Amino acid sequence: HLFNHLFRYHYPSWDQILQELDTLSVATLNPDCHVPALNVEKTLYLAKTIQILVQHRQSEPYLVPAARANLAYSLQQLYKLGNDKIRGVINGMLPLVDAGCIGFERELIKGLPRVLTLQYPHTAPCTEWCLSHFVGASGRLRSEVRDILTTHNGTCAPSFEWMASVVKKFFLVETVIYEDFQDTDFNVQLNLCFFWTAVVQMYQRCIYEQKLVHIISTSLTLLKSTARSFFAWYDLYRPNLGSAALVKYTEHLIRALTPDCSDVELGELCSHLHHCKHALFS
C-alpha cells in the first residue's frame, strides 16, 4: 500500500519510492492535460513523502534513547533474577546504558555474553551476533528478528513502531521450556538485551551516515524537477486554473524549499498542489 513503507521504515528505500511513484495514475477530462496532471500527482506524492521524512528526522534524536530505556529496563529485570556475579557485570553496563555514555554499546557487546555464560555455564556457547546469542527463542521469533534487522545493506532501517510488533513476540512464549535453558523469564530479558543492542548499532550508523538527510535531498531534487515540468507546461499554454497568481505562488513555495525544510512548509504545499490537481480535472 502507498506510504505504508514510510510507517514501517524510519529510513525508507529510495528505489521503493521510485516504484510507488510510477504506479500513480490520473483521470482527466481533456487528454492534453493527462501528463501535466500526472506531474502534479507525482509532485504531490513527493511532497507528502518528504513531509513524513522530515518528521522522521525530527524524531531521529529520540530513537537511541528509547532503545536505551528498553535495554535498561531488561537489565534491571535481570538484576532482580541474578546472583551477585551476574549483578557485578550488570553494574558495569547499566549506568552507561542509562546515561548514554560514549562507550556504552561496546560494554554491552562484552558484558552480555558474560551474563549468558554465568547463567548457563554448561550449555552456553551485528544481526548474526545477536541471533547466535539467543537462548530459548523459537524458530518464528528468530526469523522475525532477522528480517527486522536486515538493512538490505544500507538501503533502509525499520521504524520504532515496527520493532514493538516484534518485541511482544519475545514475551508471549510462556508455554514451553527449553531443556538446556530452563529459566524462561531470564531468557526473555536477556534476549531483549541482545535485540536492543543490535537495534542501537543499526540506528547509530543510520544517524552517522546521514541516511535521512540524503534521501530528503534526492526526494527534493526530484520534486523540483517534476514540478518544473508542470510549470513549463503552464507557462506555455496558460490554462485557466482559477488564478495565475495562485500558480505563481505555488511555484514560489516549491522554489523556496530547501533540504532543511519544515513539515509546516510541505503540508502547506500539499494543500495548494491539491488545488492545481482539481483544476486540471476541470
PDB file of all heavy atoms in Angstrom, residues 51-86:
ATOM      1  N   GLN A  51       7.327  15.290   3.590  1.00  0.00           N
ATOM      2  CA  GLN A  51       6.710  15.717   4.841  1.00  0.00           C
ATOM      3  C   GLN A  51       6.857  14.650   5.920  1.00  0.00           C
ATOM      4  O   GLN A  51       7.167  14.963   7.075  1.00  0.00           O
ATOM      5  CB  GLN A  51       5.236  16.050   4.610  1.00  0.00           C
ATOM      6  CG  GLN A  51       4.599  16.867   5.723  1.00  0.00           C
ATOM      7  CD  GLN A  51       3.091  16.966   5.587  1.00  0.00           C
ATOM      8  OE1 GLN A  51       2.494  16.359   4.697  1.00  0.00           O
ATOM      9  NE2 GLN A  51       2.468  17.736   6.470  1.00  0.00           N
ATOM     10  N   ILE A  52       6.648  13.382   5.558  1.00  0.00           N
ATOM     11  CA  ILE A  52       6.844  12.293   6.509  1.00  0.00           C
ATOM     12  C   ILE A  52       8.316  12.166   6.880  1.00  0.00           C
ATOM     13  O   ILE A  52       8.662  11.992   8.056  1.00  0.00           O
ATOM     14  CB  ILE A  52       6.296  10.975   5.934  1.00  0.00           C
ATOM     15  CG1 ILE A  52       4.832  11.131   5.517  1.00  0.00           C
ATOM     16  CG2 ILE A  52       6.455   9.845   6.941  1.00  0.00           C
ATOM     17  CD1 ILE A  52       3.904  11.498   6.652  1.00  0.00           C
ATOM     18  N   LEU A  53       9.206  12.249   5.886  1.00  0.00           N
ATOM     19  CA  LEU A  53      10.634  12.086   6.143  1.00  0.00           C
ATOM     20  C   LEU A  53      11.159  13.165   7.080  1.00  0.00           C
ATOM     21  O   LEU A  53      12.012  12.894   7.934  1.00  0.00           O
ATOM     22  CB  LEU A  53      11.410  12.103   4.826  1.00  0.00           C
ATOM     23  CG  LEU A  53      11.111  10.996   3.815  1.00  0.00           C
ATOM     24  CD1 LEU A  53      11.957  11.177   2.563  1.00  0.00           C
ATOM     25  CD2 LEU A  53      11.350   9.633   4.438  1.00  0.00           C
ATOM     26  N   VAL A  54      10.667  14.397   6.930  1.00  0.00           N
ATOM     27  CA  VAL A  54      11.081  15.478   7.822  1.00  0.00           C
ATOM     28  C   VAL A  54      10.666  15.168   9.254  1.00  0.00           C
ATOM     29  O   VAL A  54      11.416  15.427  10.205  1.00  0.00           O
ATOM     30  CB  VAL A  54      10.499  16.818   7.336  1.00  0.00           C
ATOM     31  CG1 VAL A  54      10.722  17.907   8.372  1.00  0.00           C
ATOM     32  CG2 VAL A  54      11.125  17.214   6.010  1.00  0.00           C
ATOM     33  N   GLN A  55       9.473  14.599   9.431  1.00  0.00           N
ATOM     34  CA  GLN A  55       9.034  14.203  10.764  1.00  0.00           C
ATOM     35  C   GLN A  55       9.874  13.058  11.311  1.00  0.00           C
ATOM     36  O   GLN A  55      10.103  12.983  12.523  1.00  0.00           O
ATOM     37  CB  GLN A  55       7.554  13.825  10.731  1.00  0.00           C
ATOM     38  CG  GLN A  55       6.654  14.967  10.286  1.00  0.00           C
ATOM     39  CD  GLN A  55       5.216  14.540  10.082  1.00  0.00           C
ATOM     40  OE1 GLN A  55       4.920  13.353   9.946  1.00  0.00           O
ATOM     41  NE2 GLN A  55       4.309  15.511  10.060  1.00  0.00           N
ATOM     42  N   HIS A  56      10.347  12.163  10.440  1.00  0.00           N
ATOM     43  CA  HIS A  56      11.265  11.119  10.884  1.00  0.00           C
ATOM     44  C   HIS A  56      12.578  11.712  11.365  1.00  0.00           C
ATOM     45  O   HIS A  56      13.180  11.220  12.325  1.00  0.00           O
ATOM     46  CB  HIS A  56      11.522  10.123   9.758  1.00  0.00           C
ATOM     47  CG  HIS A  56      10.356   9.236   9.469  1.00  0.00           C
ATOM     48  ND1 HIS A  56      10.457   8.102   8.694  1.00  0.00           N
ATOM     49  CD2 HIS A  56       9.062   9.311   9.862  1.00  0.00           C
ATOM     50  CE1 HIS A  56       9.275   7.519   8.617  1.00  0.00           C
ATOM     51  NE2 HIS A  56       8.411   8.233   9.317  1.00  0.00           N
ATOM     52  N   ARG A  57      13.042  12.767  10.707  1.00  0.00           N
ATOM     53  CA  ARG A  57      14.292  13.378  11.120  1.00  0.00           C
ATOM     54  C   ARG A  57      14.116  14.179  12.405  1.00  0.00           C
ATOM     55  O   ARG A  57      15.054  14.285  13.204  1.00  0.00           O
ATOM     56  CB  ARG A  57      14.832  14.232   9.991  1.00  0.00           C
ATOM     57  CG  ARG A  57      15.790  15.286  10.421  1.00  0.00           C
ATOM     58  CD  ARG A  57      15.974  16.253   9.284  1.00  0.00           C
ATOM     59  NE  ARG A  57      17.230  16.964   9.393  1.00  0.00           N
ATOM     60  CZ  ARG A  57      17.870  17.493   8.344  1.00  0.00           C
ATOM     61  NH1 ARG A  57      17.377  17.377   7.121  1.00  0.00           N
ATOM     62  NH2 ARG A  57      19.012  18.133   8.533  1.00  0.00           N
ATOM     63  N   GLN A  58      12.921  14.730  12.631  1.00  0.00           N
ATOM     64  CA  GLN A  58      12.626  15.344  13.924  1.00  0.00           C
ATOM     65  C   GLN A  58      12.628  14.315  15.044  1.00  0.00           C
ATOM     66  O   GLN A  58      13.033  14.630  16.168  1.00  0.00           O
ATOM     67  CB  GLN A  58      11.273  16.059  13.877  1.00  0.00           C
ATOM     68  CG  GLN A  58      11.304  17.425  13.223  1.00  0.00           C
ATOM     69  CD  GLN A  58       9.924  17.902  12.819  1.00  0.00           C
ATOM     70  OE1 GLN A  58       9.787  18.789  11.982  1.00  0.00           O
ATOM     71  NE2 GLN A  58       8.899  17.311  13.410  1.00  0.00           N
ATOM     72  N   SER A  59      12.186  13.089  14.766  1.00  0.00           N
ATOM     73  CA  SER A  59      12.133  12.034  15.766  1.00  0.00           C
ATOM     74  C   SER A  59      13.436  11.254  15.880  1.00  0.00           C
ATOM     75  O   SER A  59      13.585  10.462  16.818  1.00  0.00           O
ATOM     76  CB  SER A  59      10.991  11.063  15.450  1.00  0.00           C
ATOM     77  OG  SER A  59       9.754  11.747  15.339  1.00  0.00           O
ATOM     78  N   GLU A  60      14.370  11.463  14.954  1.00  0.00           N
ATOM     79  CA  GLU A  60      15.609  10.688  14.947  1.00  0.00           C
ATOM     80  C   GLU A  60      16.431  10.805  16.229  1.00  0.00           C
ATOM     81  O   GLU A  60      16.959   9.773  16.678  1.00  0.00           O
ATOM     82  CB  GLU A  60      16.447  11.091  13.726  1.00  0.00           C
ATOM     83  CG  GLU A  60      17.723  10.295  13.553  1.00  0.00           C
ATOM     84  CD  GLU A  60      18.499  10.710  12.319  1.00  0.00           C
ATOM     85  OE1 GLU A  60      19.122  11.793  12.343  1.00  0.00           O
ATOM     86  OE2 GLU A  60      18.477   9.958  11.324  1.00  0.00           O
ATOM     87  N   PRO A  61      16.595  11.978  16.855  1.00  0.00           N
ATOM     88  CA  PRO A  61      17.386  12.035  18.096  1.00  0.00           C
ATOM     89  C   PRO A  61      16.763  11.300  19.273  1.00  0.00           C
ATOM     90  O   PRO A  61      17.392  11.235  20.335  1.00  0.00           O
ATOM     91  CB  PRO A  61      17.480  13.542  18.385  1.00  0.00           C
ATOM     92  CG  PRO A  61      17.211  14.203  17.085  1.00  0.00           C
ATOM     93  CD  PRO A  61      16.209  13.329  16.408  1.00  0.00           C
ATOM     94  N   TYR A  62      15.560  10.747  19.131  1.00  0.00           N
ATOM     95  CA  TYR A  62      14.899  10.035  20.214  1.00  0.00           C
ATOM     96  C   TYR A  62      14.889   8.526  20.014  1.00  0.00           C
ATOM     97  O   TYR A  62      14.377   7.805  20.878  1.00  0.00           O
ATOM     98  CB  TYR A  62      13.465  10.552  20.383  1.00  0.00           C
ATOM     99  CG  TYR A  62      13.389  12.041  20.647  1.00  0.00           C
ATOM    100  CD1 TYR A  62      13.117  12.937  19.620  1.00  0.00           C
ATOM    101  CD2 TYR A  62      13.594  12.551  21.922  1.00  0.00           C
ATOM    102  CE1 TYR A  62      13.049  14.298  19.857  1.00  0.00           C
ATOM    103  CE2 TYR A  62      13.529  13.909  22.169  1.00  0.00           C
ATOM    104  CZ  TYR A  62      13.257  14.778  21.133  1.00  0.00           C
ATOM    105  OH  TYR A  62      13.192  16.131  21.375  1.00  0.00           O
ATOM    106  N   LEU A  63      15.448   8.029  18.910  1.00  0.00           N
ATOM    107  CA  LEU A  63      15.449   6.592  18.647  1.00  0.00           C
ATOM    108  C   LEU A  63      16.375   5.855  19.610  1.00  0.00           C
ATOM    109  O   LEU A  63      15.953   4.925  20.308  1.00  0.00           O
ATOM    110  CB  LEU A  63      15.856   6.328  17.196  1.00  0.00           C
ATOM    111  CG  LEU A  63      14.912   6.857  16.115  1.00  0.00           C
ATOM    112  CD1 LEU A  63      15.530   6.699  14.734  1.00  0.00           C
ATOM    113  CD2 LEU A  63      13.570   6.145  16.187  1.00  0.00           C
ATOM    114  N   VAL A  64      17.649   6.254  19.653  1.00  0.00           N
ATOM    115  CA  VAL A  64      18.604   5.590  20.547  1.00  0.00           C
ATOM    116  C   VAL A  64      18.215   5.737  22.011  1.00  0.00           C
ATOM    117  O   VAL A  64      18.286   4.740  22.746  1.00  0.00           O
ATOM    118  CB  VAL A  64      20.031   6.069  20.249  1.00  0.00           C
ATOM    119  CG1 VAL A  64      21.016   5.463  21.237  1.00  0.00           C
ATOM    120  CG2 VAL A  64      20.419   5.716  18.820  1.00  0.00           C
ATOM    121  N   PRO A  65      17.816   6.916  22.514  1.00  0.00           N
ATOM    122  CA  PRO A  65      17.382   6.979  23.921  1.00  0.00           C
ATOM    123  C   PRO A  65      16.220   6.055  24.240  1.00  0.00           C
ATOM    124  O   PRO A  65      16.171   5.488  25.338  1.00  0.00           O
ATOM    125  CB  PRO A  65      17.000   8.455  24.100  1.00  0.00           C
ATOM    126  CG  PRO A  65      17.823   9.172  23.103  1.00  0.00           C
ATOM    127  CD  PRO A  65      17.893   8.262  21.913  1.00  0.00           C
ATOM    128  N   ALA A  66      15.276   5.889  23.311  1.00  0.00           N
ATOM    129  CA  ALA A  66      14.184   4.948  23.540  1.00  0.00           C
ATOM    130  C   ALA A  66      14.695   3.513  23.568  1.00  0.00           C
ATOM    131  O   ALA A  66      14.234   2.699  24.376  1.00  0.00           O
ATOM    132  CB  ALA A  66      13.109   5.118  22.468  1.00  0.00           C
ATOM    133  N   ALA A  67      15.648   3.183  22.692  1.00  0.00           N
ATOM    134  CA  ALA A  67      16.254   1.857  22.726  1.00  0.00           C
ATOM    135  C   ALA A  67      17.035   1.645  24.017  1.00  0.00           C
ATOM    136  O   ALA A  67      17.010   0.552  24.594  1.00  0.00           O
ATOM    137  CB  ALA A  67      17.160   1.662  21.511  1.00  0.00           C
ATOM    138  N   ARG A  68      17.734   2.684  24.483  1.00  0.00           N
ATOM    139  CA  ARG A  68      18.477   2.577  25.735  1.00  0.00           C
ATOM    140  C   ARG A  68      17.542   2.356  26.918  1.00  0.00           C
ATOM    141  O   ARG A  68      17.846   1.564  27.818  1.00  0.00           O
ATOM    142  CB  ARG A  68      19.325   3.832  25.952  1.00  0.00           C
ATOM    143  CG  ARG A  68      20.591   3.896  25.109  1.00  0.00           C
ATOM    144  CD  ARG A  68      21.258   5.264  25.209  1.00  0.00           C
ATOM    145  NE  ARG A  68      20.976   5.922  26.483  1.00  0.00           N
ATOM    146  CZ  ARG A  68      20.494   7.156  26.599  1.00  0.00           C
ATOM    147  NH1 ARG A  68      20.253   7.883  25.516  1.00  0.00           N
ATOM    148  NH2 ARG A  68      20.264   7.670  27.799  1.00  0.00           N
ATOM    149  N   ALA A  69      16.400   3.048  26.933  1.00  0.00           N
ATOM    150  CA  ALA A  69      15.454   2.895  28.035  1.00  0.00           C
ATOM    151  C   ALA A  69      14.929   1.469  28.120  1.00  0.00           C
ATOM    152  O   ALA A  69      14.791   0.914  29.217  1.00  0.00           O
ATOM    153  CB  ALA A  69      14.299   3.882  27.878  1.00  0.00           C
ATOM    154  N   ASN A  70      14.632   0.856  26.972  1.00  0.00           N
ATOM    155  CA  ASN A  70      14.159  -0.525  26.981  1.00  0.00           C
ATOM    156  C   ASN A  70      15.251  -1.481  27.439  1.00  0.00           C
ATOM    157  O   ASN A  70      14.984  -2.416  28.203  1.00  0.00           O
ATOM    158  CB  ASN A  70      13.648  -0.917  25.596  1.00  0.00           C
ATOM    159  CG  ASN A  70      12.362  -0.209  25.232  1.00  0.00           C
ATOM    160  OD1 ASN A  70      11.508   0.028  26.087  1.00  0.00           O
ATOM    161  ND2 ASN A  70      12.216   0.135  23.959  1.00  0.00           N
ATOM    162  N   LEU A  71      16.487  -1.266  26.985  1.00  0.00           N
ATOM    163  CA  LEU A  71      17.579  -2.137  27.407  1.00  0.00           C
ATOM    164  C   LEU A  71      17.855  -1.977  28.896  1.00  0.00           C
ATOM    165  O   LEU A  71      18.114  -2.963  29.596  1.00  0.00           O
ATOM    166  CB  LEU A  71      18.832  -1.847  26.585  1.00  0.00           C
ATOM    167  CG  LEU A  71      19.757  -3.049  26.375  1.00  0.00           C
ATOM    168  CD1 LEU A  71      20.606  -2.863  25.127  1.00  0.00           C
ATOM    169  CD2 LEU A  71      20.629  -3.294  27.593  1.00  0.00           C
ATOM    170  N   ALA A  72      17.803  -0.741  29.398  1.00  0.00           N
ATOM    171  CA  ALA A  72      17.980  -0.521  30.830  1.00  0.00           C
ATOM    172  C   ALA A  72      16.914  -1.254  31.631  1.00  0.00           C
ATOM    173  O   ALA A  72      17.201  -1.807  32.700  1.00  0.00           O
ATOM    174  CB  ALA A  72      17.954   0.975  31.140  1.00  0.00           C
ATOM    175  N   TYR A  73      15.680  -1.286  31.123  1.00  0.00           N
ATOM    176  CA  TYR A  73      14.604  -1.972  31.829  1.00  0.00           C
ATOM    177  C   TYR A  73      14.870  -3.470  31.921  1.00  0.00           C
ATOM    178  O   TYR A  73      14.734  -4.072  32.991  1.00  0.00           O
ATOM    179  CB  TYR A  73      13.266  -1.708  31.139  1.00  0.00           C
ATOM    180  CG  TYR A  73      12.128  -2.518  31.716  1.00  0.00           C
ATOM    181  CD1 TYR A  73      11.498  -2.127  32.890  1.00  0.00           C
ATOM    182  CD2 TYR A  73      11.690  -3.680  31.093  1.00  0.00           C
ATOM    183  CE1 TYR A  73      10.462  -2.867  33.424  1.00  0.00           C
ATOM    184  CE2 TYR A  73      10.656  -4.427  31.621  1.00  0.00           C
ATOM    185  CZ  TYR A  73      10.044  -4.015  32.786  1.00  0.00           C
ATOM    186  OH  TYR A  73       9.012  -4.754  33.315  1.00  0.00           O
ATOM    187  N   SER A  74      15.244  -4.092  30.799  1.00  0.00           N
ATOM    188  CA  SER A  74      15.516  -5.526  30.812  1.00  0.00           C
ATOM    189  C   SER A  74      16.733  -5.860  31.665  1.00  0.00           C
ATOM    190  O   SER A  74      16.770  -6.921  32.297  1.00  0.00           O
ATOM    191  CB  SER A  74      15.706  -6.040  29.385  1.00  0.00           C
ATOM    192  OG  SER A  74      14.474  -6.064  28.685  1.00  0.00           O
ATOM    193  N   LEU A  75      17.732  -4.973  31.699  1.00  0.00           N
ATOM    194  CA  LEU A  75      18.874  -5.186  32.582  1.00  0.00           C
ATOM    195  C   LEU A  75      18.451  -5.151  34.044  1.00  0.00           C
ATOM    196  O   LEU A  75      18.950  -5.933  34.862  1.00  0.00           O
ATOM    197  CB  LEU A  75      19.955  -4.140  32.313  1.00  0.00           C
ATOM    198  CG  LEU A  75      20.740  -4.274  31.009  1.00  0.00           C
ATOM    199  CD1 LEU A  75      21.684  -3.093  30.844  1.00  0.00           C
ATOM    200  CD2 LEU A  75      21.508  -5.586  30.975  1.00  0.00           C
ATOM    201  N   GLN A  76      17.533  -4.246  34.395  1.00  0.00           N
ATOM    202  CA  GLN A  76      17.031  -4.198  35.763  1.00  0.00           C
ATOM    203  C   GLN A  76      16.244  -5.453  36.115  1.00  0.00           C
ATOM    204  O   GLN A  76      16.290  -5.908  37.263  1.00  0.00           O
ATOM    205  CB  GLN A  76      16.165  -2.957  35.965  1.00  0.00           C
ATOM    206  CG  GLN A  76      16.925  -1.646  35.876  1.00  0.00           C
ATOM    207  CD  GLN A  76      16.004  -0.457  35.709  1.00  0.00           C
ATOM    208  OE1 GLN A  76      14.795  -0.614  35.539  1.00  0.00           O
ATOM    209  NE2 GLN A  76      16.570   0.742  35.753  1.00  0.00           N
ATOM    210  N   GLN A  77      15.521  -6.024  35.150  1.00  0.00           N
ATOM    211  CA  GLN A  77      14.807  -7.270  35.405  1.00  0.00           C
ATOM    212  C   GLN A  77      15.779  -8.427  35.606  1.00  0.00           C
ATOM    213  O   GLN A  77      15.581  -9.261  36.498  1.00  0.00           O
ATOM    214  CB  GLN A  77      13.839  -7.569  34.261  1.00  0.00           C
ATOM    215  CG  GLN A  77      12.866  -6.439  33.978  1.00  0.00           C
ATOM    216  CD  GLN A  77      12.189  -5.929  35.236  1.00  0.00           C
ATOM    217  OE1 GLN A  77      11.525  -6.682  35.947  1.00  0.00           O
ATOM    218  NE2 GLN A  77      12.364  -4.644  35.521  1.00  0.00           N
ATOM    219  N   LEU A  78      16.832  -8.494  34.788  1.00  0.00           N
ATOM    220  CA  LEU A  78      17.873  -9.492  35.007  1.00  0.00           C
ATOM    221  C   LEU A  78      18.545  -9.305  36.359  1.00  0.00           C
ATOM    222  O   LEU A  78      18.976 -10.284  36.981  1.00  0.00           O
ATOM    223  CB  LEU A  78      18.917  -9.419  33.890  1.00  0.00           C
ATOM    224  CG  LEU A  78      18.479  -9.825  32.485  1.00  0.00           C
ATOM    225  CD1 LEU A  78      19.605  -9.590  31.490  1.00  0.00           C
ATOM    226  CD2 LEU A  78      18.048 -11.279  32.476  1.00  0.00           C
ATOM    227  N   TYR A  79      18.641  -8.059  36.827  1.00  0.00           N
ATOM    228  CA  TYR A  79      19.264  -7.787  38.117  1.00  0.00           C
ATOM    229  C   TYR A  79      18.456  -8.393  39.259  1.00  0.00           C
ATOM    230  O   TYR A  79      19.030  -8.913  40.223  1.00  0.00           O
ATOM    231  CB  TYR A  79      19.420  -6.278  38.304  1.00  0.00           C
ATOM    232  CG  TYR A  79      20.438  -5.880  39.346  1.00  0.00           C
ATOM    233  CD1 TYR A  79      21.758  -5.633  38.993  1.00  0.00           C
ATOM    234  CD2 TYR A  79      20.078  -5.742  40.679  1.00  0.00           C
ATOM    235  CE1 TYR A  79      22.692  -5.264  39.939  1.00  0.00           C
ATOM    236  CE2 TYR A  79      21.006  -5.375  41.633  1.00  0.00           C
ATOM    237  CZ  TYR A  79      22.310  -5.137  41.257  1.00  0.00           C
ATOM    238  OH  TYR A  79      23.237  -4.771  42.205  1.00  0.00           O
ATOM    239  N   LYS A  80      17.124  -8.334  39.168  1.00  0.00           N
ATOM    240  CA  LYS A  80      16.281  -8.989  40.165  1.00  0.00           C
ATOM    241  C   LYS A  80      16.549 -10.488  40.202  1.00  0.00           C
ATOM    242  O   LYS A  80      16.698 -11.079  41.278  1.00  0.00           O
ATOM    243  CB  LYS A  80      14.800  -8.731  39.866  1.00  0.00           C
ATOM    244  CG  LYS A  80      14.346  -7.282  39.922  1.00  0.00           C
ATOM    245  CD  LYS A  80      12.821  -7.219  39.961  1.00  0.00           C
ATOM    246  CE  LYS A  80      12.271  -6.018  39.205  1.00  0.00           C
ATOM    247  NZ  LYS A  80      12.715  -4.721  39.782  1.00  0.00           N
ATOM    248  N   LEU A  81      16.623 -11.116  39.031  1.00  0.00           N
ATOM    249  CA  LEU A  81      16.723 -12.570  38.905  1.00  0.00           C
ATOM    250  C   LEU A  81      18.167 -13.042  38.772  1.00  0.00           C
ATOM    251  O   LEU A  81      18.453 -13.887  37.921  1.00  0.00           O
ATOM    252  CB  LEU A  81      15.912 -13.049  37.704  1.00  0.00           C
ATOM    253  CG  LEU A  81      14.576 -12.407  37.319  1.00  0.00           C
ATOM    254  CD1 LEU A  81      13.914 -13.202  36.182  1.00  0.00           C
ATOM    255  CD2 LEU A  81      13.649 -12.244  38.529  1.00  0.00           C
ATOM    256  N   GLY A  82      19.094 -12.544  39.584  1.00  0.00           N
ATOM    257  CA  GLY A  82      20.506 -12.779  39.339  1.00  0.00           C
ATOM    258  C   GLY A  82      21.306 -12.964  40.609  1.00  0.00           C
ATOM    259  O   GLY A  82      21.059 -12.319  41.629  1.00  0.00           O
ATOM    260  N   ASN A  83      22.275 -13.877  40.531  1.00  0.00           N
ATOM    261  CA  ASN A  83      23.294 -13.990  41.562  1.00  0.00           C
ATOM    262  C   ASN A  83      24.240 -12.792  41.483  1.00  0.00           C
ATOM    263  O   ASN A  83      24.187 -11.982  40.555  1.00  0.00           O
ATOM    264  CB  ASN A  83      24.062 -15.309  41.429  1.00  0.00           C
ATOM    265  CG  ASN A  83      24.593 -15.545  40.020  1.00  0.00           C
ATOM    266  OD1 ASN A  83      25.019 -14.618  39.335  1.00  0.00           O
ATOM    267  ND2 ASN A  83      24.566 -16.801  39.586  1.00  0.00           N
ATOM    268  N   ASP A  84      25.128 -12.692  42.472  1.00  0.00           N
ATOM    269  CA  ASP A  84      25.935 -11.489  42.624  1.00  0.00           C
ATOM    270  C   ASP A  84      27.055 -11.377  41.597  1.00  0.00           C
ATOM    271  O   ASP A  84      27.599 -10.281  41.419  1.00  0.00           O
ATOM    272  CB  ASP A  84      26.507 -11.428  44.039  1.00  0.00           C
ATOM    273  CG  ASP A  84      25.423 -11.315  45.092  1.00  0.00           C
ATOM    274  OD1 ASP A  84      24.299 -11.799  44.841  1.00  0.00           O
ATOM    275  OD2 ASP A  84      25.689 -10.734  46.165  1.00  0.00           O
ATOM    276  N   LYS A  85      27.415 -12.466  40.916  1.00  0.00           N
ATOM    277  CA  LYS A  85      28.382 -12.339  39.832  1.00  0.00           C
ATOM    278  C   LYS A  85      27.715 -11.871  38.545  1.00  0.00           C
ATOM    279  O   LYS A  85      28.366 -11.230  37.711  1.00  0.00           O
ATOM    280  CB  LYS A  85      29.123 -13.660  39.611  1.00  0.00           C
ATOM    281  CG  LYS A  85      30.499 -13.475  38.980  1.00  0.00           C
ATOM    282  CD  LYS A  85      31.265 -14.783  38.862  1.00  0.00           C
ATOM    283  CE  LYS A  85      32.431 -14.635  37.893  1.00  0.00           C
ATOM    284  NZ  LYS A  85      33.213 -15.893  37.740  1.00  0.00           N
ATOM    285  N   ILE A  86      26.427 -12.174  38.368  1.00  0.00           N
ATOM    286  CA  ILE A  86      25.663 -11.569  37.283  1.00  0.00           C
ATOM    287  C   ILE A  86      25.400 -10.099  37.582  1.00  0.00           C
ATOM    288  O   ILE A  86      25.526  -9.238  36.701  1.00  0.00           O
ATOM    289  CB  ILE A  86      24.352 -12.345  37.054  1.00  0.00           C
ATOM    290  CG1 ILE A  86      24.623 -13.649  36.301  1.00  0.00           C
ATOM    291  CG2 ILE A  86      23.334 -11.489  36.309  1.00  0.00           C
ATOM    292  CD1 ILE A  86      23.390 -14.500  36.096  1.00  0.00           C
TER     293      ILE A  86
END
